[PDB]
């Protein structure tokens, strides 16, 4: 039963908006009433005693069902797509709204680019899904239902004539379906083993003409050539079928309908309007149960996109509940992290019961091998996840108790792979500050170095960037992150890696820079070149989820065996 | 007149095919005939005297000639698509066995990728319109062109009825089209930018939430909502007309020809059957009417495609005509180049004039800097392309006048970039030999020092690597490349800059085993390493499309004062 649960979840994001679905319902409905109702007078205007009487009568109103088809044949189709546009729109902004708030862990549990694709595709899908259902298959859902008893009243040998005929027609177009289905699924192997075939040996074409192979591969394309005649001959009757089906039925509903009206009226109990009233019937049952099988069809591929989208949806509806706590005001910087251990993935815990204190003013620089606790200790710093154990305590206040509005504004990080958005070079830098201006920009690129480099080359501070930095090199990319930080100039600082594909030249000033302008303010820097850690006040070794040595420049010397080792390795 | 044009040129193809069209055709006519015969006999059927009098004659030939259209509407079906089908394939085997095997100088001209991109999506698409054309249009084209006549003859004014309604929906249709077309040209700008907005912010998630930016992104988003709605609205009349055009189109055609045939026969001038026929004339009019404008449509799209692939097919048609050439036998190895000069791209010549010999048992290593000349040197003697200017001996026959296919097995060369096709690694090293076995590849292999890194890693000598070498490092191809070249064995072989990604452990005992194996031949050497040339025995300096150099290794001490200063730099 998941398709009828996914249809009406799918309805329930129409009857959101309530006032335009009942005007297309009611629309739908009264589309769908004189549909059946056109047939029965189009009888009646032919019948007319042979057709000897009164034919202004019948034909005026024929006349008026007909214009009135018309008309809604145009609002009804303007009113759905336009209805389906703005739902699909409003659906859209409303889930990207709430999946772009949510935490990273999910984010690499699943995979942004999987939830992208996933949001993109299943919003077009239910897109279509809202556009076709609402007129075109309501109209015909109640025009069927509304029919049954109609020719149950009327001519019920020709009712159960067609529903048999319906019945049968379903069935037939089942069978059809799936056994082009298995046809195709067979047939693709083979395809695709053809044109990869063309593509590899088209490409390598000096290959293949240094050693005299164009025999071989001619021949080796006319074998795969014959291999997809022989799979696609057992399935040309079921597409030919499938072709046909329509235009099969249509006509012999028509015939054993006309054949069982002649019959009938040979004998007195009928006349020539009940005939030409169910012939157009079974046309028009023919035509909607097409079109609905169709649907139902389409409904099915793209459930298993729709149910992905729904459990998505359903998994980020909730965060923790919104309140005013009380988040850290004039922040100076005292940080301290005591006895804290996490489980990264789910097992295996990296760090092991680290604890330390950074005061006001003072440089902290981790350092380490392969230990990847260190980069843990800088997630936890920024509070990406919160620690199963242990505590974090900054300006006499609870980490866990700390707007997370307030807490990103406090702390500026710039780590080893820096990512920028498809603006301008200029727009990249703006998001250092909410509102800022044009003013700082330059002073904040000068002292990143980066003005002189964006000035003249690359047409201005104005040009649009590569998705993903693209355009640039990592050098200049990581300039650019440089300057971006420095702009948002936050008390606490974070290097990861920001400087580690430069040479010396630009290195040293670069640094200079980043010192210069974090005097007055308290930096925690990570990196594998051991050149800015000479500069550092508080130097950290990090091994194997484990702290062992705490101490300035001038106390390393001779203390730490395998920092010793380090030390005199560079 | 282009539209024509490609629609004649493509019916040749099928015209080359002769029997199966012929049989397609007739029958494309015979299903024409039956469509205008049957409203005819359904009005016979009906009017039937009101409906009293012989009922079983009329309706004995409608019922036959319903089950002809079911069996005829089943056979054209499937002949059409198999047809097709075979069509196609053999459309497809000969253009690509016509394109392999014409030389490299077009390819770099016009672009692999293109041409393969050219020939799948033409081929496609004129598939497309054999399938459709032959039954459906076929039958469209010549049931009007039929009905013409019939409507003429038996109900003039209805006749002048019909044409001026069909004339009127083909020129409403085209305004409809034109104007939905402006419509989707202009919104589609908007479209793309919001979506490219969603993937660019999506994707950098983790800057978005570091900054407090959720806010500005959703609400760019909405104003980029906003800016779609506001795109949208003009277009959505023209949307709607175009889902409606059919509907309201049978409806109004139905409603004239109803109201005009009861009109007359209220005045004795008509009877019922010849209204009863013409509402199914006007009712297959408009249907064939809108599917045959849907089909131009579709034609004019493709016809960009179709032009260039008609132009791809022309310019490559013609070779050199095709003769048993007397071609080099038993070679031994002389190699004299005389006053070659050529152009590559098409102005600025690069080599000038040069002249040189090579001895049987020699092996000859050309160093050079910047200049090109060498590469080009390098193509004339595996004649990629004739040299405009100059001449080149071998065993004292021309090389003009040496069939390729002899050319290329003579000679033996490895470049920088090798290419492997997407088979097997020991599928990869087979095309050595035309024939080949098993035994020899792993002598080869051994003797390139690759059997044993592929013996083991990589899942045994039988995986399948990737696309251009995709799943294996450049040292690997390399090997590979190297294995299967001296797996060809040619007495005539080039290294071209093929071991220039590789540590000195592997190198030296490459360049032993090449030097080892070429100890019979005479190999040309290209390479930017100063290690493999110690071991030539006639070294040539190529400079600036100039030869200024030629002596051996002994030689070269004091002989030329740049390359001194090349030899004294490594
Ligand atoms: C007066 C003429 C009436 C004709 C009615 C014919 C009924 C025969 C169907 C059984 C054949 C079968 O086997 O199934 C047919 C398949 C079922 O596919 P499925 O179940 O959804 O597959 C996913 C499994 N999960 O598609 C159909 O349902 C096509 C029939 C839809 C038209 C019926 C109109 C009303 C539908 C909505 C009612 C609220
Ligand atoms: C009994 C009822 C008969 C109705 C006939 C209606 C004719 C009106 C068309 C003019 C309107 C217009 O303006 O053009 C209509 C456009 C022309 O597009 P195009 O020229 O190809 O654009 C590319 C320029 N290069 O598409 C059509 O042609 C649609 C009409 C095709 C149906 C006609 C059947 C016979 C066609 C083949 C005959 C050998």
Not at 77 to 104: F, K
Request: glycine fraction near 6%; charged fraction near 20%; include cysteine.
């Amino acid at each position: 039963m998941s398709l009828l649960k996914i249809y009406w979840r799918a309805m329930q994001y129409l009857a959101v908006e309530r006032t335009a679905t009942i005007t297309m319902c009611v629309a739908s409905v009264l589309v769908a009433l004189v549909t059946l109702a056109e047939p029965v007078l189009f009888g009646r205007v032919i019948q007319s005693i042979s057709d000897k009487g009164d034919i202004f009568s019948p034909l005026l109103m024929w006349a008026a069902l007909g214009g009135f088809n018309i008309m809604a044949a145009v609002f009804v189709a303007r009113g759905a797509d336009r209805l389906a546009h703005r739902r699909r729109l409003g659906v859209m902004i409303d889930s990207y709204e709430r999946l772009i708030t949510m935490p990273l862990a999910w984010h690499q549990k699943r995979g942004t680019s999987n939830a992208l694709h996933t949001l993109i595709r299943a919003t077009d899908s239910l897109f279509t899904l809202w556009l076709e259902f609402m007129r075109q298959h309501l109209t015909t859902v109640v025009a069927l239902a509304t029919l049954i008893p109609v020719a149950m009243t009327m001519d019920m040998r020709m009712s159960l004539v067609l529903i048999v005929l319906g019945v049968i027609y379903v069935m037939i177009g089942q069978l059809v379906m799936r056994k082009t289905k298995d046809g195709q699924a067979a047939v693709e192997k083979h395809h695709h083993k053809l044109f990869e075939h063309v593509s590899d040996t088209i490409s390598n074409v000096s290959v293949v003409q240094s050693y005299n192979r164009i025999a071989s591969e001619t021949q080796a394309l006319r074998d795969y050539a014959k291999n997809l005649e022989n799979a696609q001959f057992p399935v040309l009757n079921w597409w030919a079928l499938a072709s046909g089906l329509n235009r099969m039925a249509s006509t012999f509903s028509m015939v054993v309908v006309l054949v069982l009206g002649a019959y009938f009226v040979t004998k007195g109990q009928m006349r020539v309007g009940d005939v030409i009233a169910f012939i157009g019937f079974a046309q028009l049952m023919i035509g909607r149960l097409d079109q609905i099988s169709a649907f139902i069809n389409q409904t099915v591929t793209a459930r298993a996109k729709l149910e992905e989208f729904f459990q998505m949806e359903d998994a980020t509806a909730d965060r923790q509940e919104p309140e005013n706590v009380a988040d850290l005001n004039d922040v100076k910087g005292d940080i301290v992290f005591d006895n804290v251990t996490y489980e990264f993935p789910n097992s295996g815990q990296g760090v092991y019961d680290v604890s330390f204190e950074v005061k006001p003013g003072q440089t902290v620089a981790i350092v380490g091998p392969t230990g990847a606790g260190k980069t843990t200790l800088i997630n936890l710093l920024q509070r990406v996840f919160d620690p199963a154990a242990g505590r974090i305590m900054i300006d006499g206040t609870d980490t866990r108790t700390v707007s997370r509005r307030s807490l990103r504004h406090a702390i500026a990080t710039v780590f080893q792979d820096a990512g920028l958005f498809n603006r301008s070079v200029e727009d990249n830098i703006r998001v250092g500050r909410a509102n800022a201006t044009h003013e700082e920009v330059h002073a904040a690129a000068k002292a990143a170095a980066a003005h002189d480099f964006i000035l003249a080359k690359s047409e201005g501070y104005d040009t649009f960037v590569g998705e993903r930095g693209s355009q640039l090199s990592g050098g200049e990319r990581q300039r650019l992150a440089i300057a971006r930080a420095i702009l948002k100039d936050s008390p606490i600082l974070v290097l990861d890696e920001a400087t580690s594909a430069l040479d010396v030249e630009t290195e040293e000033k670069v640094t200079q820079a980043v010192d210069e302008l974090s005097h007055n303010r308290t930096t925690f820097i990570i990196a594998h070149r051991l050149s800015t850690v000479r500069s550092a006040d508080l130097v950290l070794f990090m091994d194997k989820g484990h702290l062992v040595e705490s101490g300035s420049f001038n106390e390393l010397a001779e203390r730490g065996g395998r920092f010793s080792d380090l030390l005199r390795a560079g």
